[PDB]
């Protein structure tokens, strides 16, 4: 529910989309009352084309906030904060079992919606300790977590996550567990790693509740793309197409599945078509990192990797044809990967034959041992002098 705001706020942020995108982003805060969260989200971005207000930046986004939106924003943020003050006060005096637990709870849907950290830090923590219906506790801890993600503060988010971790096994509700997987994953992308995020994400696909989450169609497409950056072609490909995922969903996967399918088929020609369509639809609607490099780079090597494994020699003429991308472009894309050490092939362009070093036996490994060794040794020589003195 408040999760719907981050994905929309991603839309002006990413480089596949820009200016129009603010009008849609603006509509959601009036409707939900998420208004405080949106205002907060402008600061978090720190200018990548955002801030649709008549208050400031009227033509800079070429969209603006409405007058009703402004009065409602103020009304909603103040009401929640106002209630919070009195409930915090009244609650202490009476029963600790009942009164405080209820009072914090009453605030809590509203408190996350506004995204106000300060009021939240004290109120949220008190509820959890005292046992009641176990499913209820889990739901509540989730609202505390939503506030911290909005700012992109590392500290606040990590702090929030820990209370949930303790609680989840305690309740044991596997439906509720699945929610904790999504929050961690957003945060995991937030630092950098899609790789961590991917592992969590794959689990969430099984059992799904759309409460405190956006929608099930949005998430499945996210999960298959994030899985892919982490996982190689054999296992992910088999799960999405041959398994349940496309049949049940009733088609929203086609962009990401096409991208995996080409590798399986050994017709690279589809791979290159699939890249543009997946990039805009699936990957880039994200507040937490609309950063193509991890996705794109990992997929480009996976495509080459299988081709290199299957033959000791190839022609250029075959490579160029299969991909369909040009001779120069294929060389250029490769230049990064070989140099980085993702791959290890060469193209003798002028004679149009490609020689491939195989990944088999001690030799490929000897090359490898040395690579880890040089840096290790370098760190060692520094260490020997510093400790000794």
């Amino acid at each position: 529910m408040p999760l719907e705001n981050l994905e929309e706020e991603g839309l002006p942020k990413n480089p596949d989309l820009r200016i129009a995108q603010l009008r849609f982003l603006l509509s959601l805060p009036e409707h939900r009352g998420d208004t405080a969260v949106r205002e907060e989200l402008m600061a978090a971005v720190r200018e990548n084309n955002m801030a649709p207000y008549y208050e400031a930046l009227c033509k800079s986004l070429d969209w603006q906030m409405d007058m009703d939106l402004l009065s409602k924003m103020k009304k909603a943020n103040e009401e929640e904060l106002k209630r919070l003050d009195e409930e915090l006060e009244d609650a202490e005096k009476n029963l600790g079992e009942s009164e405080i637990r209820d009072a914090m709870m009453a605030k809590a849907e509203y408190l996350c919606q506004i995204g106000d950290k300060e009021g939240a830090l004290t109120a949220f923590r008190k509820t959890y300790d005292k046992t009641v219906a176990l499913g209820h506790r889990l739901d509540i801890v989730f609202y505390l977590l939503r506030i911290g993600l909005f700012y992109m503060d590392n500290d606040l988010i990590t702090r929030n996550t820990e209370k949930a971790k303790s609680l989840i096994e305690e309740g044991g509700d596997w439906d509720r567990r699945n929610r904790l997987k999504v929050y961690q994953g957003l945060y995991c992308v937030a630092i950098r790693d899609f790789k961590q995020a991917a592992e969590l994400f794959l689990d969430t696909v099984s059992t799904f509740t759309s409460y405190e989450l956006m929608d099930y169609k949005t998430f499945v497409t996210y999960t298959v793309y994030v899985s892919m950056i982490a996982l190689e072609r054999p296992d992910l490909r088999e799960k999405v197409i041959k398994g349940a995922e496309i049949l049940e969903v009733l088609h929203s996967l086609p962009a990401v599945r096409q991208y995996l399918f080409s590798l399986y088929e050994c017709r690279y020609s589809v791979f290159f078509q699939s890249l543009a369509v997946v990039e805009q639809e699936m990957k880039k609607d994200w507040l937490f990192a609309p950063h193509y490099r991890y996705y794109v780079r990992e997929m480009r090597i996976h495509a080459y990797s299988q081709l290199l494994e299957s033959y000791r020699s190839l022609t250029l003429g075959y490579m160029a044809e299969a991909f369909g991308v040009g001779v120069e472009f294929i060389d250029q894309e490769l230049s990064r990967f070989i140099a980085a050490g993702r791959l290890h092939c060469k193209i003798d362009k002028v004679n149009e034959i490609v020689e491939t070093n195989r990944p088999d036996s001690k030799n490929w490994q000897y090359q490898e041992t040395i690579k880890k060794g040089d840096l290790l040794l370098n760190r060692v020589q520094k260490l020997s002098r510093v400790i000794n003195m």
């Binding site: 490099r293 991308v325 120069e328």
Partner: peptide
């Protein structure tokens, strides 16, 4: 190295052009 997405965008467009004419 890293921060590839920017150049990547340019790579994708040009590549398509080359991709249509050449492909089998």
């Amino acid at each position: 190295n890293v921060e590839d997405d920017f150049s990547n965008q340019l790579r994708a467009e040009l590549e398509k052009h080359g991709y249509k004419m050449e492909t089998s």
